[PDB]
Amino acid sequence: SEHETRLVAKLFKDYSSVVRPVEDHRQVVEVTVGLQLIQLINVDEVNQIVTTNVRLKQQWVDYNLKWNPDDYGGVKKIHIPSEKIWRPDLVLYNNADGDFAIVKFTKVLLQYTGHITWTPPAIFKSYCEIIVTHFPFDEQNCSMKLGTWTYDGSVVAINPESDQPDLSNFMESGEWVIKESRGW
Amino acid sequence: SEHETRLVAKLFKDYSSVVRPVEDHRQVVEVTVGLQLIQLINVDEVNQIVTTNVRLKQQWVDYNLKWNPDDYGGVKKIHIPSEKIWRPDLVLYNNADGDFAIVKFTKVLLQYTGHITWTPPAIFKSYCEIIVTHFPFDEQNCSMKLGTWTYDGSVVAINPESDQPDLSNFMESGEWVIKESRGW
Amino acid sequence: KNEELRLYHHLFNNYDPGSRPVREPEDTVTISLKVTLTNLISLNEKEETLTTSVWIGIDWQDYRLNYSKDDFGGIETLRVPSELVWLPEIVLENNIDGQFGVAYDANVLVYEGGSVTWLPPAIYRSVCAVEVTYFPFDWQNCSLIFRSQTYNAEEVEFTFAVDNDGKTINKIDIDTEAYTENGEWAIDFCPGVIRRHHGGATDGPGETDVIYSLIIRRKPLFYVINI
Amino acid sequence: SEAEGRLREKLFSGYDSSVRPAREVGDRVRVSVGLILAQLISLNEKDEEMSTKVYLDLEWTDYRLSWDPAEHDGIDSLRITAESVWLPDVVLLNNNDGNFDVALDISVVVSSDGSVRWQPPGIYRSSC
Amino acid sequence: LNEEERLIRHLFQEKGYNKELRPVAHKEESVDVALALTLSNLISLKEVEETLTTNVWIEHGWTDNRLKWNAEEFGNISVLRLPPDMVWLPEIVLENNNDGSFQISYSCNVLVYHYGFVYWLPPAIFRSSCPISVT
Ligand SMILES: *[C@@H]1O[C@H](CO)[C@@H](O[C@@H]2O[C@H](CO)[C@@H](O[C@@H]3O[C@H](CO[C@@H]4O[C@H](CO[C@H]5O[C@H](CO)[C@@H](O)[C@H](O)[C@@H]5O)[C@@H](O)[C@H](O)[C@@H]4O)[C@@H](O)[C@H](O[C@H]4O[C@H](CO)[C@@H](O)[C@H](O)[C@@H]4O)[C@@H]3O)[C@H](O)[C@H]2NC(C)=O)[C@H](O)[C@H]1NC(C)=O
Ligand SMILES: *[C@@H]1O[C@H](CO)[C@@H](O[C@@H]2O[C@H](CO)[C@@H](O)[C@H](O)[C@H]2NC(C)=O)[C@H](O)[C@H]1NC(C)=O
Structure with a gap:
């Protein structure tokens, strides 16, 4: 694994995490965003807050984090601390009383092409308008608005990974049934 | 402060907090341990947890932290941050849902002879078998097991400062009376 | 001159803790796992949360941290911070609470021959769906699922630790002498299983984890006497 | 604020914030301790604890942090991050929750004669 | 992003930006800070604890003349996230x-414009003292 040590020393010698990772500043950073819902922890009807456990899969290419595997003993992917690189600053725009942004800075998977996949965990506490007219037989539409807090579309573009949230690893709830889910 | 400034700069020039503080690796670090009970915060019978406020006086000798006072203007004792030095890693083995080790890193008093006293505070939440047979007239024999988590007796030895916990600064409890106390 | 300092500078002057201890990228790191439960603090039915105190025992090999006692004054063990x-x-x-890691970052023990042992303690609050049908005369099946947050099954794999006799410890270990039973919950069973999945062609890299299943029985005396 | 930058560089060259200021061995540092009560938050009878919001008022002299204003564009005082200077380790001894320290470290005000005034906020839960 | 990399090197390393010092020419000057508050949602008002919980976006605007540049000398860059x-x-x-x-x-990035204006919009959850009139 001395190849990986040499490679990581090479990639971060003159690297800047402040700067957006594309070759020309007039270009846009294309970020693919997908949400995986692990658990619907609780719905608070009084304060109108939905707390969930999620994984926020973010994919983007970093122009300066590329290498030839043949020059580094066949290494084609590595794991890097997320604090070290530039990241999109996704924020839950309708956060109720939780964290606004990602606080668990797990490692990113970096490919030799420069593609970065980062799947941080998060507990999202969102503000959901609760209609109690038909409580206990009520139906609640709860959204999670996500966006780059400080970057506008002309510098960083976000696109959905899928038309729907990923519910493949969703833990069953004893209080709610998810009829429909969708990302726009 | 010029004398102590120069002394500290000398002491931590070539210092290592990783290795044990002995001239010879075949020697044992002799640590004197004394528990002082400041307050008995709570006895949770349902979850079987005893919450106490304590001071964990730890005394040992660091071989490499010695100096001649005459070479430093007569300075015979100093106070230094505890995070810079090797420490014993005392852990509450029967911790229930609190902190396993010391988390409040207060200053150590260092003598010119290498003697270190370190009296950090802690909130101990100790798991203890609670017998409720005679409640409300119940007696509870609770315990706090302390030890060096990663060091065995062949490399680090712990000895009690006294046969009994120090109750000299114990605040009176409005719910409990300490009939007996002892360290083994 | 303390030989521990010489050994420490010999093992760590040129050492990268960010790279796996494998000579080739395609090699796998085998991790021997044991999980010891010291206390079952509670099962909160309203939040569906199991609170436990454990210490995880993790053993593996790091060929870069290999040394012989004869070359270092007879030292057979070196304690170093886990961060190194x-x-x-x-x-x-x-x-359930967002806490993924261990409670206290204890030292790792580096033995001669490249063997690394880490024994961190932890307080864990885990999801346990409560089957209410026979409450308070109920038994629950609370899972503890452990997996690498970073590495896939080709990069890191798991095996269970073995006792002195060599029998595989495919269960939660409990020290009988030091164990105090929870006031409301008795631990009847605690098997462990290493699962491997998502190795399909479409799925891509394989994934693995270790699931322990605490089968716990409520002691219903409080509800019988009082309600 | 180039004059302030030069003054700060002069003051913190060779300064050790972990060393108590005593020009001679045996000199005691006199610390003046006062308290401003912003709010009496509560007195919990169940937990037997008083919760208050306060500003401490700590004053002491540090001879190392003295200068002549005439040589520094007439700067008679500075505001410095508290972690940059030596602080007296004044804590609430009778706290009930394990928290000994102040809520926010903020900044000290240092005068040209070495006088240091520090007024950190604190939310304290004390045993009553 | 060669040009923003060059611009950041110019602003912070070439000219030696010191964040400890205020953006004033003389110590006797004061920095004008403009503040606005946006209320995202009123979380609650707990009467027993007499606490107001709010989610607010505080807009801060000030001027830092050390952080000025000509947009045309740096590839028409007009704004920077730092x-x-x-x-x-x-x-x-x-x-x-x-x-x-x-x-x-959440300590989000600051926006720095070429004419020296620093815009900063940190969001916050705040729990504040609200004495309750129960009459
Ligand atoms: C306490 O809680 C634990 C955890 O929930 C319980 O253990 C689990 O019990 C389940 C049964 O209730 C087990 O699931 C069955 O496993 C059988 C084992 O046979 C193997 O099947 C493999 C097939 O692929 C597996 O892996 C893929 C991974 O991608 C997965 O998608 C598949 O679904 C499947 O799990 C095969 O490769 C292997 O060689 C074995 O043959 C399996 O046969 C069962 O399948 C039957 O039932 C399902 C029902 O949906 C049906 O669709 C199938 O056609 C078939 O009839 C189950 O999958 C699970 O593995 C246990 N987990 C462990 C032990 O880790 C435990 O029982 C609980 N204790 C109590 C209640 O006392
Ligand atoms: C750690 O180093 C020792 C010493 O080099 C290794 O032990 C040797 O193993 C080889 C075979 O691989 C034998 O030929 C030698 O005789 C052994 N020792 C001596 C005296 O050289 C040991 O295998 C190494 N451990 C690891 C994990 O690589």
């Missing part, structure tokens, strides 16, 4:  | 909190 060595980054995946 | 720990900040706090969280929750 590569770690498999084992986490509880099914936590 | 971590807040690189620049001097006018540390504004909620004075009348009752839990000890004096500061903003």
Whole structure:
């Protein structure tokens, strides 16, 4: 694994995490965003807050984090601390009383092409308008608005990974049934 | 402060907090341990947890932290941050849902002879078998097991400062009376 | 001159804790796992949360941290901070409070021959769906799922630790003398299983984890006497 | 604020914030301790604890942090991050929750004669 | 992003930006800080604890003449996103909190425009003292 040590020393010698990772500043950073819902922890009807456990899969290419595997003993992917690189600053725009942004800075998977996949965990506490007219037989539409807090579309573009949230690893709830889910 | 400034700069020039503080690796670090009970915060019978406020006086000798006072203007004792030095890693083995080790890193008093006293505070939440047979007239024999988590007796030895916990600064409890106390 | 300092500078002057301890990228790191439960603090039915105190025992090999006692004055063990060595980054995946890691970053013990042992303690709050049908005369099946947060099954794999006789410890270990039973919950069973999945062609890299299943029985005396 | 930058560089060259200021061995540092009560938050009878919001008022002299204003564009005082200077380790001894320290470290006000005034906020839960 | 990399090197390393010092020519000058508040949602008003919980976006605007550049000498760049720990900040706090969280929750990037204006919009969750009139 001395190849990986040499490679990581090479990639971060003159690297800047402040700067957006594309070759020309007039270009846009294309970020693919997908949400995986692990658990619907609780719905608070009084304060109108939905707390969930999620994984926020973010994919983007970093122009300066590329290498030839043949020059580094066949290494084609590595794991890097997320604090070290530039990241999109996704924020839950309708956060109720939780964290606004990602606080668990797990490692990113970096490919030799420069593609970065980062799947941080998060507990999202969102503000959901609760209609109690038909409580206990009520139906609640709860959204999670996500966006780059400080970057506008002309510098960083976000696109959905899928038309729907990923519910493949969703833990069953004893209080709610998810009829429909969708990302726009 | 010029004398102590120069002394500290000398002491931590070539210092290592990783290795044990002995001239010879075949020697044992002799640590004197004394528990002082400041307050008995709570006895949770349902979850079987005893919450106490304590001071964990730890005394040992660091071989490499010695100096001649005459070479430093007569300075015979100093106070230094505890995070810079090797420490014993005392852990509450029967911790229930609190902190396993010391988390409040207060200053150590260092003598010119290498003697270190370190009296950090802690909130101990100790798991203890609670017998409720005679409640409300119940007696509870609770315990706090302390030890060096990663060091065995062949490399680090712990000895009690006294046969009994120090109750000299114990605040009176409005719910409990300490009939007996002892360290083994 | 303390030989521990010489050994420490010999093993760590040129050492990268960010790279796995493998000579080739395609090699796998085998991690021996044991999980010891010291206390079952509670099962909160309203939040569906199991609170436990454990210590995880993680053993592996790091060829870069290999030394002989004869060349270092007979030292057979070196304690060093866990931050200086590569770690498999084992986490509880099914936590409910956002706490994935261990409670206290204890020292790793580096033995001669490249063997690395890490024994961190932890307080875990895990998801346990409560089957209410026979409450308070109920039994529950609370899972503890452990997996590397970073590495896939080709990069890090798991095996169970073995006792002195060599019998595989495919269960939660409990020290009988030091164990105090929870006031409301008796631990009837605690098997462990290493699962491997998502190795299909479409799925791509394989994934693995270790699931322990605490089968716990409520002691219903309080509800019988009082309600 | 180039004059302030030069003054700060002069003051913190060779300064050790972990060393108590005593020009001679045996010199005691006199610390003046006062308290401003912003709010009496509560007195919990169940937990037997008083919760208050306060500003401490700590004053002491540090001879190392003295200068002549005439040589520094007439700067008679500075505001410095508290972690940059030596602080007296004044804590609430009778706290009930394990928290000994102040809520926010903020900044000290240092005068040209070495006088240091520090007024950190604190939310304290004390045993009553 | 060769041009923003060059611009950041020019602003912070070439000219030696010191974030500890205020953006003033003389110590006797004061820095004008403009403040606005946007209320995202009123979380609650707990009467028993007499606490107001709010989610607020505080808009801070000030001028830092050390952070000026000609957009045409740097590839027509007109705005930069920077971590807040690189620049001097006018540390504004909620004075009348009752839990000890004096500061903003998420320290987002500052926006620095070529004419020296620093825009900063940190969001925050605040728990403040609200005495309750029960009459
Ligand atoms: C306490 O809680 C634990 C955890 O929930 C319980 O253990 C689990 O019990 C389940 C049964 O209730 C087990 O699931 C069955 O496993 C059988 C084992 O046979 C193997 O099947 C493999 C097939 O692929 C597996 O892996 C893929 C991974 O991608 C997965 O998608 C598949 O679904 C499947 O799990 C095969 O490769 C292997 O060689 C074995 O043959 C399996 O046969 C069962 O399948 C039957 O039932 C399902 C029902 O949906 C049906 O669709 C199938 O056609 C078939 O009839 C189950 O999958 C699970 O593995 C246990 N987990 C462990 C032990 O880790 C435990 O029982 C609980 N204790 C109590 C209640 O006392
Ligand atoms: C750590 O180093 C020792 C010493 O080099 C290794 O032990 C040797 O193993 C080889 C075979 O691989 C034998 O030929 C030698 O005789 C052994 N020792 C001596 C005296 O050289 C040991 O295998 C190494 N461990 C690891 C994990 O690589």
